[PDB]
Amino acid sequence: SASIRDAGVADLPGILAIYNDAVGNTTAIWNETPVDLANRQAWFDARARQGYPILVASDAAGEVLGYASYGDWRPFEGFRGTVEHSVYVRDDQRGKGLGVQLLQALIERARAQGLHVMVAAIESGNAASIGLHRRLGFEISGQMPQVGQKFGRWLDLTFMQLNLDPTRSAP
Amino acid sequence: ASIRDAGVADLPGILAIYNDAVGNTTAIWNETPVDLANRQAWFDARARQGYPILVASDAAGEVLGYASYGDWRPFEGFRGTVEHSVYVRDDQRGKGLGVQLLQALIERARAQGLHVMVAAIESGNAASIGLHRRLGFEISGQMPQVGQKFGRWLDLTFMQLNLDPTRSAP
């Protein structure tokens, strides 16, 4: 069982581990270079400055079982109503619905912040991640062949999105 | 018009085109004009990365249009992919300068050993979508209301061209 809450500085070591595990063992991050704590501390502060949340799923021991966050999608003012999010569940916490918990909480935050669209960039072969998003209302909006690479092979990218306030006809 | 690499002397002309697009089109999703310094820094950033900036020019050396490309997404895994842009001065539209510029860019990207060129086009811009389609680009995404300008929501269409289809692995 896990509770969803805002991340604090003491959560960074845990977040760092999950981040680096994904970097080394998955196609969730299209980087093969692990980062250090200072890197995550800078990221932590940068998110706060933009008013973007960093959420963690923590257990009784206070261990970080997963985390989620979102930030700018494209670097132009025209996209200020759109954010790209990410969800990472610890390798030993799969099948426990933590991904759903985190994304649902993240969606509520994004909507409350007055954002218009959330975009997910998912390695196309990741059926589980795509399925989780589909179940939460996200629709496929991009399918790009060989735009990336990792582990010495080309990777395809799938874009999915959720309109947080479809009844708002204009910004 | 002839295509050539941009020089510092071309920045004022590029600036005018850029700011015209900022205030009049959906080609640039920003509503604030930039200054010469801004485009000089952009010019230098490109040169630093080895990325080209081409201009369509006449004998008088006037900038009739320009094109360039840079990183698409900020992760090493996308190093084989670049996002490009093509801008034709308003009065020079309908003269094939866009085709000239994009063709030149494509050849440059291929010669640089790049793998994929990505175009992010405002969905209602059929002219731009057609230009790309006729040069081998394929639609790869339709993202509604992900942008905004002129007080309205804008849709983004993604298109892409694989520069080396036979290269099965990086």
Swiss-Prot record, chain B:
Class of enzymatic activity (EC top level): transferase
Keyword line: Acyltransferase, Transferase
Gene name as annotated: pitA
Catalytically driven reaction(s): L-methionine sulfoximine + acetyl-CoA = N-acetyl-L-methionine sulfoximine + CoA + H(+); L-methionine sulfone + acetyl-CoA = N-acetyl-L-methionine sulfone + CoA + H(+)
InterPro entries the record matches: Acyl_CoA_acyltransferase, GNAT_dom
Protein name: L-methionine sulfoximine/L-methionine sulfone acetyltransferase
Pfam families: Acetyltransf_1 (PF00583)
UniProt subunit comment: Homodimer.
Catalytic activity, EC: 2.3.1.-
